[PDB]
Amino acid sequence: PKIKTVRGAAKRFKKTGKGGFKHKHANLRHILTKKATKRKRHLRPKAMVSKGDLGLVIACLPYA
Amino acid sequence: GIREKIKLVSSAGTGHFYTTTKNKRTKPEKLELKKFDPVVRQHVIYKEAK
Amino acid sequence: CYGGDISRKKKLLQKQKEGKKRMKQI
Amino acid sequence: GGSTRNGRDSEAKRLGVKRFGGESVLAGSIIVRQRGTKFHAGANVGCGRDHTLFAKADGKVKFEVKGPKNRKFISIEAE
Amino acid sequence: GFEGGQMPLYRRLPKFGFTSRKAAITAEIRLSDLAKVEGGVVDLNTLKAANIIGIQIEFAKVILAGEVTTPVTVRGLRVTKGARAAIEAAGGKIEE
RNA sequence: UUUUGUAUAAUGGGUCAGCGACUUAUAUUCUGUAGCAAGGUUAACCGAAUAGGGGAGCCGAAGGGAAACCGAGUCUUAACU
RNA sequence: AGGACCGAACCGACUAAUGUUGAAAAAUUAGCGGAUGACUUGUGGCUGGGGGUGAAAGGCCAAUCAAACCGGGAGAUAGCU
RNA sequence: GUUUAUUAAAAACACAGCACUGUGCAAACACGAAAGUGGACGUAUACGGUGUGACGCCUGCCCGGUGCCGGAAGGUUAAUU
RNA sequence: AAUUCCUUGUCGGGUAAGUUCCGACCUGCACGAAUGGCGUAAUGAUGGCCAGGCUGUCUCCACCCGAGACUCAGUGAAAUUGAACUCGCUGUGAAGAUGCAGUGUACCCGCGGCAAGACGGAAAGACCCCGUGAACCUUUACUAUAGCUUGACACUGAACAU
RNA sequence: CUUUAAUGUUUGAUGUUCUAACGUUGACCCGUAAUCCGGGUUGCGGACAGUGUCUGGUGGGUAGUUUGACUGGGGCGGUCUCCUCCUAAAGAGUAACGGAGGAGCACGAAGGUUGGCUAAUCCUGGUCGGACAUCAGGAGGUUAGUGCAAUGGCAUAAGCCAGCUUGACUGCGAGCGUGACGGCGCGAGCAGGUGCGAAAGCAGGUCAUAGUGAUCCGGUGGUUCUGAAUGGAAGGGCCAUC
């Protein structure tokens, strides 16, 4: 029967206007004080998933 | 190791705070220094531990 | 037996010498 | 024994070089612990905090030689 | 999603979710429609009887998808400025 | 057959005759093909029954944003050059 | 008198020879041990598989026991051949 | 005397004897959801468990560690309130 | 020494000659007092060592009597087997040749024999590592748990007392 | 408040006795030509004991599992991330149980800036005072110094001293560099507002490279974003953070 979405994936990706997926950056959850301010300021904006890893997200979310 | 972590509360009524580190073994004196406050868009004094 | 291991043999030679240190001076 | 262990890359080497396009602000010569193996000279100031160099304007990379006691001084032909 | 014992790509990356619930009941129309609404008066329903929206929906918006020619009375819909001028181009009534 | 490598003294078969190993279902993607084309499509079911009825629905036509919201833009920001 | 004594039937199993696709899936031939007893045996009876029973070797329970046999979960799974 | 039937018969097991320890009887304990039954139609000169293993001469020193046993103060403590 | 690794410990007995044996010393690598110590007449299909007797165990085999083996008649199997027109030496080669190269010898085929080979046949190991394989077993491995106890309330009451 | 006695009272502990719950594998009667069981008479015991729910302790008596890799066969030893030099063959990169050594931080100043400064070591004079304290003089030119291991650095000093200081800022960032990725690294410039200087200009942490932790889970502080009939709340989002 129907393919099931890997629900962990559903909560960590979201398709855009041209079949990308974007994902929130790592290193933005704790131990922040020892990190440089600049780094954190460059981690907030969303970023599109890598070319080499895209096929996995493609294969995990049929109903994306 | 030994060196402690500390809040930096604004004197301004806004809840903004920086974060910092200093020893208890070395200098007892509590910190005083002004820094920019984005919610106020103005430099304001900062202090306090905890 | 011989086996070819190094520490498995020097123990034996150590016993063989350790007895001779007594038996000589006696 | 126990004399193993090792560091990794820390890539430190010239990259933008010679007739490099010198576009905008490329890191021509990225050597770590530098500011000695090469130097500022041309329209670029370079001098990253870790002595990384970079162009400040479009132009050719140069590699010169200047003041007393020789030295290197990377610069940029303007254009 | 497996890839050796290495921690998987849909696990290294932190969650940012939050379903809106409300979003489920806000369909949007396009100008190419409501020439087919028939009867000359658009509503949160009517189109719902024209099956160009769906049944559950409450809120709806017009949006300039382009091309409207015959006059039409927009009514009870929120609408984008471009769509507003667009309906004005039809001479369309725009009441709240 | 498995290996870097086998006449190998590496595994397997005494021989002949039969049987004997990439399927089935539901989904999803791409390619090929045919139908209609800014629209395409019916499912259960009624039925003189491979007809015809049935558009509930699905998919495409606008996206951005966590979200309200906004919308040929939008989010980010006190603000975008 | 006796878990006395030498020794047949009776029970047992120490040595050696054979036998090793045997006559025999444990036996034969020549010796050996117990032989009034913690014996030997016929006939029925009961204890049941993570339990029996055990003068304790992890032995024995239908020629199989560090967990019986038959059926069901059952096309267990098999990064291996 | 008994044991690994089907490679091991012993310097293994058992034993009378000794000791510790449990139990006053609706015993301790064991088989059982429980009923009941064995213990036993017995009662501390009795019955279970453990160690040792005729007889003779003997059975040293240590209670910190571990368990058991005996302790009416105190510290710490769950359910309930 | 059923304990002693070094060990064929040192001394004495026994033998022509004694790594075992019997006796004693203590330097007890690492015996010791109920997971008993030291003695012990009797008892052992028990462990080791000695001696008389006796013998083919032996120097050294020899001859004979029976059943097989052998020839004849009748029945008549088995493990195995890729295919063979199936030689020796020297060398190379997946590295220990009937098969390749070079060389030598060699008419065709049985029967009785002997076992050096065909990495001969029989057990897809009894050994080792591996496998995020199973099994059982142990304990202060982790989490549970039968049972044994702890206290609250319930079945569960009345007077009286400090 | 206070040390607290007392009669009002509240509920609690143990202690004694009482019997009608409850037990009786004490005795007799009957059911009944019966040691089971039940009723009856009666003895003892007694609100104790026992059974239920909840609860602490104990528990290899029983059950389900775990018990790392590299490895010059395995075991034992030994290492497992992070930085520097060699091996590494003049781009980058490049292995071994190959050769040497370090880190799991330190600091609100050792940060910012303005102005100023020049080392070691050696020689001779010189009070206690010498081989080596402080002074002068001369050579000498970085053979010194850097919060720390090792290379590259450093006189415009990044080396040392002082004045004023918080840019160790907030919002973005053309470009690149480096990785399979998760990421990591550089950076002009722009906007806000801040410090030094007269002014140019400098400062988005330490001379540079080590000084570290993904996701989940939660705890705190801000946030009209969401708030299952409406209004709030509960959580959840979001930014900051442990």
Curated annotation (Swiss-Prot), chain A:
Residues 1-21 are annotated as: Disordered. InterPro entries: Ribosomal_bL35, Ribosomal_bL35-like, Ribosomal_bL35_CS, Ribosomal_bL35_sf. Residues 9-21 have a biased composition (Basic residues). Transmembrane segments: none annotated. Pfam families: Ribosomal_L35p. GO terms for cellular component: cytoplasm; cytosolic large ribosomal subunit. Part of the 50S ribosomal subunit. Belongs to the bacterial ribosomal protein bL35 family. This is Large ribosomal subunit protein bL35. It comes from Escherichia coli (strain K12). The lineage of its organism: Bacteria, Pseudomonadati, Pseudomonadota, Gammaproteobacteria, Enterobacterales. The gene is rpmI.
Curated annotation (Swiss-Prot), chain B:
GO terms for biological process: cytoplasmic translation; response to antibiotic; ribosomal large subunit assembly. GO terms for molecular function: structural constituent of ribosome; tRNA binding. One of its GO terms (cellular component) is cytosol. Coiled coil: none annotated. Keywords: Methylation, Ribonucleoprotein, Ribosomal protein, RNA-binding, tRNA-binding. Belongs to the bacterial ribosomal protein bL33 family. Part of the 50S ribosomal subunit. Cross-links to the P and E site tRNAs. Surface exposed on the 50S subunit. This is Large ribosomal subunit protein bL33.
From Swiss-Prot, chain C:
Belongs to the TRAFAC class translation factor GTPase superfamily. Classic translation factor GTPase family. LepA subfamily. The chain holds residues 553 to 578 of 599 of the full protein. This is Elongation factor 4. It is found in: Cell inner membrane. It comes from the Bacteria. Transmembrane segments: none annotated. Required for accurate and efficient protein synthesis under certain stress conditions. May act as a fidelity factor of the translation reaction, by catalyzing a one-codon backward translocation of tRNAs on improperly translocated ribosomes. Back-translocation proceeds from a post-translocation (POST) complex to a pre-translocation (PRE) complex, thus giving elongation factor G a second chance to translocate the tRNAs correctly. Binds to ribosomes in a GTP-dependent manner.
UniProtKB/Swiss-Prot annotation, chain E:
GO terms for cellular component: cytoplasm; cytosolic large ribosomal subunit. It comes from the Bacteria. One of its GO terms (molecular function) is structural constituent of ribosome. GO terms for biological process: cytoplasmic translation. Keywords: Ribonucleoprotein, Ribosomal protein, RNA-binding, rRNA-binding. The keyword Zinc-finger does not apply. Part of the 50S ribosomal subunit. Contacts the 5S rRNA. This protein binds the 5S rRNA. It is required for the late stages of subunit assembly, and is essential for 5S rRNA assembly onto the ribosome. Belongs to the universal ribosomal protein uL15 family. This is Large ribosomal subunit protein uL15. The gene is rplO. The chain holds residues 49 to 144 of 144 of the full protein.
